[PDB]
Amino acid sequence: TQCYAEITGWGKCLPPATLSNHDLSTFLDTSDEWIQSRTGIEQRRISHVNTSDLATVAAQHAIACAGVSVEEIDLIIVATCSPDSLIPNIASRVQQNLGIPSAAAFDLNAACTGFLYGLETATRLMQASHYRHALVIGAERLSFYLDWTKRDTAVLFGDGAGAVVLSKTEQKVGLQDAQIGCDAQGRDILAVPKFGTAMDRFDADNGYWAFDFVGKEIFKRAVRGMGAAAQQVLARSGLSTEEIDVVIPHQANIRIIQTLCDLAGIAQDKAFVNIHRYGNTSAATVPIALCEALEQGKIKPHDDLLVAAFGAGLTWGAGHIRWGERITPLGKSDAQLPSCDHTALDLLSKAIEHCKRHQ
Amino acid sequence: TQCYAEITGWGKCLPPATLSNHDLSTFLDTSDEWIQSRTGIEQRRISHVNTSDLATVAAQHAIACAGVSVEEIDLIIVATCSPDSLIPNIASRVQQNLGIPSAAAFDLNAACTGFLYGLETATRLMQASHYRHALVIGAERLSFYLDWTKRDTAVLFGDGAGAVVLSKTEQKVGLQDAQIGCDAQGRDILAVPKFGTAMDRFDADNGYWAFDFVGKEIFKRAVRGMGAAAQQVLARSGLSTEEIDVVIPHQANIRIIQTLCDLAGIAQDKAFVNIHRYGNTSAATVPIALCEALEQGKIKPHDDLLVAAFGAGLTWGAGHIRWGERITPLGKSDAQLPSCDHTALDLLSKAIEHCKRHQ
Ligand code: NA
Ligand code: NA
């Protein structure tokens, strides 16, 4: 008997400390004019807490939004490439924080495509086996990684988390067809090769790692990768392009999003965009954007959503989500991060000082 | 129409440098007598290459064993908690090394239960969607993490990789029912909290991290977790315990494996054990053990396998695999690691010196 994973809960956690384009302009040869025109980004958030904490708050909001009890959750996937720790995983920390008993809990790493990978994986696990409710979270603290002397990457990335709760049903809703993949031959153009077990653990300079980033090749391959994936999704599902009501894309560059819509013949005003506020938050982009699309009344019952993402790997993906009946939360959560009496510059102060002094 | 993921290929990669119990005895207050009697471990392997390289060789062997071409692989999961890098993932590095086009590729972290999680995930992905062949790899270089002044953990862990290839079929083979989970309340008893984004990136002492490990509580919870999971698997499948032909367990302690069989009423001689040779290789234990069980003629066509694992999280799992017709490789691979003209003590020399000098 055919089953589905309906998205019944959504939630986000953006940390409060805000790094503006002008803030970056004080310690870097860049400008608000260049950044906003090339990328669309105006602000990003910088976390004063760990990735697991951002993930926990978003999940709390999603659970309240779904009206599910913690004892109903059977599966927790955290999509991240910036986990607090590797032993143990941070899906288990989120589980511990929420008091969810027994659920399967793992971290998934597919970089910026991680939430799509996670939604796909959770959806298939639910359809093929005995998982009735899932929590899928994209959460990142990319500020940990940045080279504060390197303008090419330092202005692109932010911190945050988004979550969904999935509920098993016989109604034809949630993620339908999905096409995810990886173009591995281009792996080297977007990489931090020396954070991980490849790094020299006892070298005192091991913190001063390179963030390889070939913006132009990334731009080109992302358009092509997402584009092809979206076409496969639309083709297999028998949908005309006008039947897509909303695009929820990965938020890496506004011009990538525009080019994607243009080449697919999707009207620009169907794309939800919040990159101006948050920047590229990797695995978090899609579920935050989905959460806010719902908050802002952009999605209607029964809408067809196109999701699309791309990332280091080079990972890629697209998916068709058919929304159900409810675009309103069942409940609200007063869950919050601890207060932060610091600016974004204050938080990055030490890291910036070290990066400049080492150069 | 009901589909299955048959295990058609298996492979392993053990690095050649061998750390004996006596080797550990020279720089640590421990002995071969204590280690072998408490844990069963006599030797472990210490890698001279990165995790991705171990994963690549095992995958190569598995592909040759399955007789599949690299263009047929649709999905690559690497289970690891010791990846070379976080950006990008190492599933993509394995993909790049093998020349596999387009496949979905992600890293999964559920610590020592990672391979079970990965097998489950790949199997459900294949059953519910359009993935025809998968590569699932457990790969670890745990020697990166160890505190060479701490005997409690330094003698338990080794390096290695194991892989399987899965092929979609209508025959009722491969992983059948599976029960995976996580008991998150005991998360703090097995942890390296300060490797990851929680660590101070610019502290020169950030390499001297604690490896928290409460052996006794871990022992007790592992028996109970795996035991309960195995019972659920057996119960749901309508199998009597005598119908299990082989147990392929996680290899963390021989006494855990024995207790598991004892309490389930499974005969001890059905458990495949190689912990004496390799130690605890985390996500790699199960697929290396499976690979060697097949190499050594322990598995017959149509056998029922019980798999069980446990790990940091505390993650846990069990699964029933029904084997198919073939226990022999279709082909062999001459794929090898680069030669290593060093001992295990030679390789660890620098790390050991730093750990001792810092104390
Ligand atoms: Na429609
Ligand atoms: Na049998």
Name the closest ligand to CA A240. Answer: 1
Amino acid (1-letter code) at residue B286:
V
Taking an 8 Å cut-off on Cβ atoms, the answer to whether B105 and A110 are in contact is yes
Discontinuities after residues in chain A (C–N over 2.5 A): none
3-state class of B148 per DSSP?
coil
- Bridge partners, residue A164, by sequence: A10, A136
- The residues with which B10 forms a beta bridge, in sequence order, are B164
Q: HEC states along chain A?
A: CCCEEEEEEEEEECCCCEEEHHHHHCCCCCCHHHHHHHHCCCEEECCCCCHHHHHHHHHHHHHHHHCCCHHHCCEEEEECCCCCCCECCHHHHHHHHHCCCCCEEEEEECHHHHHHHHHHHHHHHHHHCCCCEEEEEEEEEHHHCCCCCCHHHHCCECEEEEEEEEEEECCCCEEEEEEEEECHHHHHHEEECCCCCCCCCCCCCCCCCCCEECHHHHHHHHHHHHHHHHHHHHHHCCCCHHHCCEEEECCCCHHHHHHHHHHHCCCHHHECCCHHHHCECHHHHHHHHHHHHHHCCCCCCCCEEEEEEEEHHHEEEEEEEECCCCCCCCCCCCCCCCCCCCCHHHHHHHHHHHHHHHC
Number of domains in chain B: 1
Give CA–CA dist A343/A349, Å, rounded.
10
B250 has catalytic annotation: yes
**Number of Cα atoms under 13 Å in the Cβ half of residue B120:** 32
Is B190 in Cβ contact with A89 (below 8 Å)?
no
Lookup: tokens for B19: 């750390």
In whole angstroms, what is the distance from residue A64 CA to residue A129 CA?
A: 25
Instruction: State the first-to-last Cα distance of chain A, in angstroms, to the nearest integer.
Output: 61
- Cβ B61 vs Cβ B288: under 8 Å: no
CB contact under 8 A, A109 and B86: yes
Sheet holding A133-141: strands in order across?
A: A4-13, A159-169, A133-141, A75-79, A104-109, B104-109, B75-79, B133-141, B159-169, B4-13
Q: What is the CA radius of gyration of chain B?
A: 19
Q: Going by DSSP bridges, is the β-strand pair A246-249/A304-311 parallel, antiparallel, or unpaired?
A: parallel
Interstrand relation of A18-20 and A43-45 (parallel, antiparallel or unpaired): antiparallel
Q: How many CA atoms lie within 13 A of A5 on its CB side?
A: 29
Look up residue B113 and give its amino acid.
Answer: T
Q: List the one residue out of B89, B87, B195 whose CA is nearest residue B137.
A: B89
CATH number at residue B245: 3.40.47.10
Q: Is B60 helix (H, G, I), strand (E, B) or coil?
A: helix
Residue range(s) defining the domain that contains residue A4: 1-359
Q: Which of B293, B352, B355, B302 is nearest to B325 (CA)?
A: B302
Residues of B in contact with A207 (CB under 8 A): 201-202, 206
DSSP code for B130: S
In terms of Cβ atoms closer than 10 Å to its own Cβ (0-12, 13-18, 19+), residue A208 is middle
The technique by which this structure was obtained is X-ray
Residue B323: CB partners within 8 Å, gap ≥ 6? B7, B173, B299, B300, B301, B302, B303, B304, B305
- H or E element at residue B216: helix B215-237
Measured in angstroms, how far is the CA atom of residue A287 from the centroid of ligand 1? 21
C-alpha–C-alpha distance, residues B21 and B190, integer Å:
22
Residues A178 and A319 sit within 8 Å (Cβ to Cβ): yes
Three-class DSSP category at B123: helix
